[PDB]
């Protein structure tokens, strides 16, 4: 297995992820944006069904992007939200993040850690609209010299082949 972290490091990283999720839930988008590192890469792919022979050989049908964002892209989405003309988020949706199965492992890069969690995102919109997104997430966190952490990378997996929500206007 990988050279795992101690108790304190796991506690700190888990608390940092909890605080980030709370920031996303409390509609403090600028602070959440300030929590991210400069070189963030915020990706997400589709999911397909392959033939049994393809699965055994390791071959998969072609996929594509749903999210491919740098830090400026996320900034730009937030600034679109702040204008008040984003009719997709008027009124804003109310979301809750549940983070579980937190597994933390080291990396050969000094002071950069890899994290794998399972997430359940509950998105409730106005007047009886509910949606559940369930999946896994591979993040990376960098520790600065000021005892604070920054999100260096985030990879999201959504387990729906045919997404059942007309849009994804909320950040994962």
């Amino acid at each position: 297995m990988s050279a795992q972290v101690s108790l304190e490091l796991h506690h700190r990283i888990s608390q940092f992820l909890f605080h980030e999720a709370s920031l996303l839930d409390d509609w403090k988008f600028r602070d959440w944006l300030a929590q991210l590192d400069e070189e963030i890469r915020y990706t997400m792919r589709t999911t397909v069904n392959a033939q049994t022979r393809d699965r055994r050989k390791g071959v998969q049908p072609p996929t594509t992007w749903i999210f491919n964002d740098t830090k400026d892209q996320l900034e730009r989405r937030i600034a679109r939200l702040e204008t008040g003309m984003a009719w997709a988020e008027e009124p804003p949706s109310r979301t809750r993040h549940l983070i579980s199965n937190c597994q933390i492992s080291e990396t050969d890069i000094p002071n950069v850690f890899a994290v794998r969690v399972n997430y359940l995102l509950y998105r409730a919109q106005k007047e009886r609209d509910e949606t559940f997104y369930v999946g896994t997430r591979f993040d990376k966190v960098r520790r600065l010299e000021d005892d604070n952490w920054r999100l260096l990378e985030r990879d999201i997996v959504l387990d729906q082949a045919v997404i059942t929500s007309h849009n994804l206007s909320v950040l994962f």
Binding site: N68, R76, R77, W87, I163, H166, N167, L168
Partner: protein
């Protein structure tokens, strides 16, 4: 039981004065009649020829609500079969794409060849002592499949006009995107699939006749989005002229331009590529279609696309109050890998389930569908009067029936076509009614 006899479609549409009744987006018997007469006879998009390149390659798609498999034959041709076994109607194929030599039913074990013939019935001598004629029990074949410059169109009927005669003048505007270079076009990297809770007519009407909505719905995206040179500002600000073509249910619209500039959303490398290949595009097509890099198009019923962003969409109806979206990113086959990656990034950033522009469109369609539940919210007339009575035929090399870009000739034509198809048995009567309507619209 569904009996169309007591239905009267013509009372819900008034294309002469430009009025519509919103019941058509909710009535379920209307939806069943649609499934019987619209999707049962009109040509439907199956797949791009670059997804089934070699013999034995298949692709799983839909034609209406029906599952269909499209497979490339051994001699080079292409066939489409209804994805259903002949013994208890079990599904024979489940994957999205791949290579296969036979389709095997997982329930009992009947096996079919890639050309639809029944090649293996387990224990035939015992189970069928009187003999089974394997010829009558082949897969259900789509009698009409035809390819146009890379796009495969299928049709359940056989009395319909051919693909060229059915497309008519929209081929002139479609060649502007399919025929830019030498070597055709090709699909890049997978399909995006999702579900929107709205009737299928809303996106068709918007992509056939609405450029107006882009002024106020996508204002935030214009403010925020607008490192190689992109367009300075949205085209409608600086455009000198405009054009919208609407005929036989097909629609198109764009702004005239002086330089090969796409919209502001596209990445810089895409615009650089278009500027580079402008010379070849002008050589093949002409001046008007080579400068056309921003607009909207729609082929009836469910084939939509945009020019500059290089995005193509297919709209599968799922009941009277849902639709499923299939999205393709199609580029030129002669481009390089970096340009193809730029095209993919631009298209998926702009018009995905999480793109800056599809958000508002989907939200608005869903809101309209939610409002339409009540009894008084679906019995009140609406306004289709934009640009009414201003239809003219150009004489400078652009064919069809034309109008200014902010008009609703295309939507009125589409609704007339839909009401004519629903209310007529044979295709000849559809053609006669459409010819009479087009005679009336000019006088």
């Amino acid at each position: 039981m569904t009996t169309p006899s007591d239905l009267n479609i013509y009372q819900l549409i008034d294309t002469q004065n430009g009025r519509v009744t919103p019941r058509i987006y909710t009535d379920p018997d209307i939806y069943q009649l649609e499934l019987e007469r619209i999707f049962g006879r009109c040509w439907l998009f199956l797949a791009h020829e670059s997804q089934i390149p070699k013999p034995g390659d298949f692709f799983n798609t839909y034609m209406g609500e029906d599952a269909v498999v499209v497979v490339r034959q051994k001699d080079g041709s292409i066939k489409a079969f209804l994805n259903q076994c002949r013994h208890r109607a079990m599904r024979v194929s489940y994957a999205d794409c791949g290579n296969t030599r036979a389709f095997t039913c997982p329930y009992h074990g009947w096996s079919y060849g890639i050309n639809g013939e029944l090649i293996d019935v387990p224990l035939e001598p015992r189970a069928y002592p009187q003999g089974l004629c394997k010829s009558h029990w082949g897969l259900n074949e789509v009698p009409c499949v035809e390819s146009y410059k890379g796009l495969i169109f299928g049709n359940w009927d056989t009395s319909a006009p051919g693909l060229r005669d059915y497309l008519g003048d929209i081929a002139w505007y479609l060649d502007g995107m399919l025929d830019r270079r030498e070597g055709g076009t090709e699909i890049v990297g997978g399909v995006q699939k999702w579900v929107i809770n709205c009737n299928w007519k809303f996106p068709a009407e918007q992509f056939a006749s609405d450029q107006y909505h882009a002024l106020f719905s996508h204002a935030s995206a214009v403010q925020v989005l607008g490192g190689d040179g992109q367009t300075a500002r949205p085209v409608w600000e600086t455009a000198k002229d405009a054009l919208q073509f609407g005929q036989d249910g097909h629609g198109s619209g764009f702004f005239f331009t002086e330089k090969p500039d796409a919209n502001v959303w596209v990445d810089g490398a895409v615009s650089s590529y278009y500027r580079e290949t402008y010379a070849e595009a002008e050589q093949r097509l002409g001046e008007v279609r080579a400068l056309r890099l921003a607009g909207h198009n729609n082929i009836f019923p469910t084939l939509s696309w945009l020019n500059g962003t290089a995005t193509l969409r297919v709209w599968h109806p799922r009941g009277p109050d849902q639709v499923e979206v299939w999205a393709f990113c199609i580029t030129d086959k002669a481009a390089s890998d970096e340009v193809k990656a730029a095209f993919e990034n631009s298209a998926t950033r702009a018009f995905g389930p999480a793109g800056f522009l599809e958000q508002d469109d989907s939200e608005n369609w869903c809101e309209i569908q939610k409002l339409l539940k009540g009894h008084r919210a679906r019995n009140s007339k609406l306004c289709l009067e934009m640009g009414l009575g201003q239809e003219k035929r150009r004489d400078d090399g652009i064919p069809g029936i034309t109008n200014y870009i902010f008009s609703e000739t295309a939507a009125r034509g589409m609704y007339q076509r839909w009401a004519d198809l629903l209310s007529s048995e044979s295709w000849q009567e559809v053609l006669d009614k459409t010819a009479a309507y087009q005679q009336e619209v000019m006088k």
